[PDB]
Design a protein around this ligand. Structure first.
Ligand SMILES: [Zn+2]
Lengths: 317, 53, 120
RNA sequence: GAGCGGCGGUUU
RNA sequence: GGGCCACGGAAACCGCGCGCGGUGAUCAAUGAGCCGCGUUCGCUCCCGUGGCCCACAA
């Protein structure tokens, strides 16, 4: 049940004395509802029927948004986890598109096969598979239940793996053939089936409860802080005196770091966080965790995407 | 639709009673929604009562 | 039991429900399925609305009880959507049914609107 | 303009 | 010069799918079939225009 996103990370401390000034910035739950939307992500449970693109156009018209973008496009008949990044948080999907996914799938065999052979043949698909020509990882498959020709199973895969096509190859390897009759995405990156997973009915009702009834509590729980879209990434946390500089397009130099995750290698996509855990920017490491820790000078992260507004923190340079 | 789930356990199953926990299961897929939402007004009348607003 | 199920209904009262639907079908005029049922209420044509208690997802019929009340149309719950479907003259199930024109069920229906009346 | 996680075809 | 932010890098028809309205079915009423109307998100590069900064964190 393990995806590469699940790896636990260790926090290496670089500047023990760093503290944050509670007067600057807006940590997630200090955000007024309007600001929460501007930097919000919805963990939407997509219904079977409409395309991913239509669903988002609905959300935009009904919530009066200018902009919104989903991650991994689910097919029309497929339900489940569809991250919807809103307004100024739109560009964080680029952090999810590449993340692992998980599905519960219903496979219909075209001929009779013993239960044991199904389970045994399916376990052989863990590891690499081919399709399109391209290669792609299956991290795990588990067979929940078999009912004659109906096989219900969970599968964890890398971004861009077609389950439909996986199921077809399972059908060929059994001889009798098979098609996918039902599909549901249960996870995408840090988005999972928890209490944040919200249907469209709930989404739109909470919205109205807020707009028309003055109750803010449900709509506010319906939207997640954009920081959520970044839980799976390695992070470096920076001092207050580097934050406005970073938001102004400065590269992040070693002397700006308070804390970082262990195991960062050159080239890695990193999230840059304030000590309040607000998201500042996405960048690409120019140093390993050990270098950033030992050194006192140099560029540590190449700042590529900046999300935090330039006025949350003072120009401390 | 055939895929179901335990509201207690989160087990996915084809059965009506969870095999881990024994609770009645529910259809995994979300209800269909339409941008017209003709009965929204009445669904919200019901949902407030449930929630307590 | 489901949250759209707004009150407890006796076994023989829910049996009469199927009866009125049984009769009305062939002596009178009904509508089967939540979409026709909902049309009939909005159009003010339904004399009685019957809702099944095992509807999953709840959203399928949950707008029904509050819609009736707006149109002051009586509604009752029956145990099963399979049984309610068979009564309506189809093999498949029915989340809900509207009895448009009663017939041999005139008294039965009139009776039911009275019993349920007290449960509100 | 070239890609990622295609809605498909024809006209300037 | 360099980084970062914004805008831009097509338009009208047809079709599938889906949705809504209407009709409502010899195991799809949690909606067949048919008729009419609606309907498809963004991201990454790179190039152009414009805005903000040039900040090793003090
Ligand atoms: Zn369990």
């Amino acid at each position: 049940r393990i995806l590469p996103a699940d790896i636990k990370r260790e926090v290496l401390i670089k500047d023990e004395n760093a503290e944050t000034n509670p007067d600057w910035g807006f940590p997630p739950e200090k955000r007024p509802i309007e600001m929460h939307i501007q930097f919000g992500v919805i963990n939407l449970d997509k219904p079977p029927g409409p395309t991913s693109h239509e669903v988002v156009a609905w959300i935009k018209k009904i919530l009066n948004l200018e902009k919104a973008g989903h991650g991994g496009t689910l097919d029309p008949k497929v339900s489940g986890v569809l991250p919807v990044a809103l307004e100024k948080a739109t560009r964080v999907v680029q952090a999810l598109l590449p993340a692992g996914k998980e599905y519960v799938a219903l496979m219909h065999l075209h001929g009779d096969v013993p239960e044991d052979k199904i389970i045994q043949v399916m376990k052989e698909f863990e590891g690499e598979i081919i399709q399109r020509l391209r290669t792609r990882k299956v991290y795990y498959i588990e067979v929940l239940e078999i009912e004659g020709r109906d096989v219900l199973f969970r599968v964890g895969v890398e971004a861009g793996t077609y389950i439909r096509s996986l199921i077809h190859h399972i059908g060929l390897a059994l001889g009798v053939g098979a098609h996918m009759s039902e599909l549901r995405r249960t996870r995408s990156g840090p988005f999972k089936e928890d209490e944040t997973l919200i249907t469209l009915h709930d989404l739109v009702d909470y919205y109205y409860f807020w707009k028309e009834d003055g109750i803010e509590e449900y709509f506010r729980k319906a939207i997640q802080p954009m920081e959520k879209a970044v839980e799976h990434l390695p992070k470096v946390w920076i001092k207050d005196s580097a934050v406005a500089a970073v938001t102004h397009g400065a590269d992040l130099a070693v002397p700006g770091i308070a804390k970082l995750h262990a195991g960062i290698k050159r080239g890695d996509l990193v999230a840059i966080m304030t000590l309040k855990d607000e998201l500042v920017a996405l960048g690409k490491a120019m140093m390993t965790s050990q270098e950033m820790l030992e050194k006192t000078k140099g560029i540590a992260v190449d700042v590529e995407k900046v999300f935090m507004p330039r006025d949350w923190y003072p120009k401390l340079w | 639709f055939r895929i179901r789930k335990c509201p207690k356990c989160g087990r996915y199953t084809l059965k009506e009673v969870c095999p881990v926990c024994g609770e009645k299961t529910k259809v995994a897929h979300p209800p269909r929604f339409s941008p017209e939402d003709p009965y929204g007004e009445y669904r919200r009348r019901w949902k407030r009562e449930v929630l307590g607003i | 039991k489901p949250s759209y199920v707004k009150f407890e209904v006796p076994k023989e009262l829910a049996e009469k429900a199927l009866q009125a639907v049984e009769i009305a079908r062939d002596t009178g005029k009904i509508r089967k399925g939540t979409n026709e049922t909902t049309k009939a209420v909005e159009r003010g044509q339904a004399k009685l609305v019957i809702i099944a208690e095992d509807v999953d997802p709840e959203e399928i019929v949950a707008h029904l009880p509050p819609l009736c009340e707006e149109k002051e149309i009586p509604y009752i719950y029956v145990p099963s959507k399979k049984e309610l479907g068979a009564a309506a003259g189809i093999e498949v199930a029915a989340a809900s049914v509207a009895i448009i024109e009663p017939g041999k069920a005139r008294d039965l229906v009139e009776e039911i609107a009275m019993k349920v009346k007290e449960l509100m």
